[PDB]
With several copies, the nearest count.
Chain A
Amino acid sequence: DPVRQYLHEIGQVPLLTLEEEIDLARKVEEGMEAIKKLSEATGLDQELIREVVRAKILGTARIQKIPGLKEKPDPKTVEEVDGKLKSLPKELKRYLHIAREGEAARQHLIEANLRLVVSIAKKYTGRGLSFLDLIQEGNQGLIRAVEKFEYKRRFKFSTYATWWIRQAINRAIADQARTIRIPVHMVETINKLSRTARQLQQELGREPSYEEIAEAMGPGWDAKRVEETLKIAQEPVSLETPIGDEKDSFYGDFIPDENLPSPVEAAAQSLLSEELEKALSKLSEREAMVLKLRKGLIDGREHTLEEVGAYFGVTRERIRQIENKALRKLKYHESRTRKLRDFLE
């Protein structure tokens, strides 16, 4: 059972005292700024030796071994760096070790206030992610708040962390939610609208008409706007939805397939094609061939008057009147024969 699993996995470590908290933040920031001063040392970048710290701390080669087929070169961009600062005097080395212990501190910190995250996200169930899923995204929120927090602020880390938790959570549900992808601002305005609708549904003692709720919103909000975003609201309905009073009556197999041709349609198209194909020979040998271009027959792509004119060596005007007389000669044969009179839709 994967749920109660993490439930006992979090309580495996104590949370923290104020002391431990401040100490954690202490060695964290001192470590990171040590990485800064280290960036001034061998000329390395700010973020470079940082992730390199993860290279020799978070484990052996397992870290960058499989981050997709492309993340960042291990034997090239990492290896030499790991050996470039090994040659360096006491100062740069002490800064090194400071970096190591600092990042580790970041980790421990994260786990405690991860217990915290667990509670917070535990209150958010039913967003389309049952428990862990939700929680996990929520967790990473704290992570971003871990590096952005300062012990100097004299605030319990729980506060900052919490707000960032609700951040990660709401962004995650905004980006996942219904099966149809929806933009973040869009989701915002959605839950905004439904908020209002809820409120004045309870106040008015009844459900609001489109115009009064849309008015309750503000400027530019009308019945059509709410009706619109309401149409977008509802998600795709599952095909596996059983209908009727039985189990065996399904939904998915009740949908017609019009995206593909039908036998009647296949023979219909083949028919128009053939019947018109033989109706072709009764036209002037030149004007028929020309007519195959202007109407987009030969290669499927319609050729302009200029092109067909560039074909028979005649001006485009010629091709034009050619089309007039051709289509009308055909018109005689049609109005007479009454063979192709069908296909009138």
Chain B
Amino acid sequence: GKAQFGGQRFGEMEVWALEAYGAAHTLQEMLTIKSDDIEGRNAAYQAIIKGEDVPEPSVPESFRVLVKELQALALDVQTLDEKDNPVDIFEGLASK
């Protein structure tokens, strides 16, 4: 919206086109640093404010919400790595 002071959304077809160009980072930054990423947007503002280059994002954070939703459905959400091993997507968060 306008009076809500908010940015444009990147449609599914927008995403697709962006991929069609083959801009990998532009897309990545778009879905992460540039939008909702946890420390991504923050560390970005930090970066440009200081003149440095924005680091690489970790979790889009809409994704994490998706994960915990699936958890509410008792869907076991297992994020592996280079070879078949549990990765902690939530840093120190729910370890009980």
Direct contact of A and B (CB under 8 A): yes
Interface residues of A, Cβ cutoff 8 Å to B: 254, 261-264, 266-267, 270
B46 close to A267 (CB less than 8 A): yes
Look across to chain B and name the residue whose beta carbon is closest to the beta carbon of A261.
B42
Interface residues of B, Cβ cutoff 8 Å to A: 1, 4, 41-42, 44-46, 49
Q: How far is the CB of B6 from chain A (nearest CB, A)?
A: 9
B4 close to A267 (CB less than 8 A): no
18 contacts across the A-B interface (CB closer than 8 A): A254-B1, A254-B4, A261-B42, A262-B42, A263-B41, A263-B42, A263-B44, A263-B45, A263-B46, A264-B45, A266-B42, A266-B45, A266-B46, A267-B42, A267-B45, A267-B46, A267-B49, A270-B46
Chain A residue numbers with a CB within 8 Å of B44 are 263
Chain A residue numbers with a CB within 8 Å of B41 are 263
Interface centre among A254, A261, A263, A270, by most chain B C-beta atoms within 10 angstroms, is: A263
Q: How far is the CB of B47 from chain A (nearest CB, A)?
A: 10
Chain A residue numbers with a CB within 8 Å of B49 are 267
Look across to chain B and name the residue whose beta carbon is closest to the beta carbon of A271.
B49
Q: How far is the CB of A219 from chain B (nearest CB, A)?
A: 48
Look across to chain B and name the residue whose beta carbon is closest to the beta carbon of A263.
B45
Look across to chain A and name the residue whose beta carbon is closest to the beta carbon of B41.
A263
Apart from A263-B46, A266-B45, A267-B45, what 6 extra A-B contacts exist at CB < 8 Å? A254-B4, A263-B44, A263-B45, A264-B45, A266-B42, A266-B46
Chain B residue numbers with a CB within 8 Å of A263 are 41-42, 44-46
Chain B residue numbers with a CB within 8 Å of A261 are 42
Interface centre among A254, A262, A267, A270, by most chain B C-beta atoms within 10 angstroms, is: A267
Chain A residue numbers with a CB within 8 Å of B46 are 263, 266-267, 270
Look across to chain A and name the residue whose beta carbon is closest to the beta carbon of B44.
A263
Q: How far is the CB of B40 from chain A (nearest CB, A)?
A: 9
Q: How far is the CB of B32 from chain A (nearest CB, A)?
A: 14
Chain B residue numbers with a CB within 8 Å of A267 are 42, 45-46, 49
Q: How far is the CB of A278 from chain B (nearest CB, A)?
A: 15
Chain B residue numbers with a CB within 8 Å of A266 are 42, 45-46
Q: How far is the CB of B43 from chain A (nearest CB, A)?
A: 8
Look across to chain A and name the residue whose beta carbon is closest to the beta carbon of B38.
A260
Chain B residue numbers with a CB within 8 Å of A270 are 46
Interface centre among B1, B4, B41, B45, by most chain A C-beta atoms within 10 angstroms, is: B45
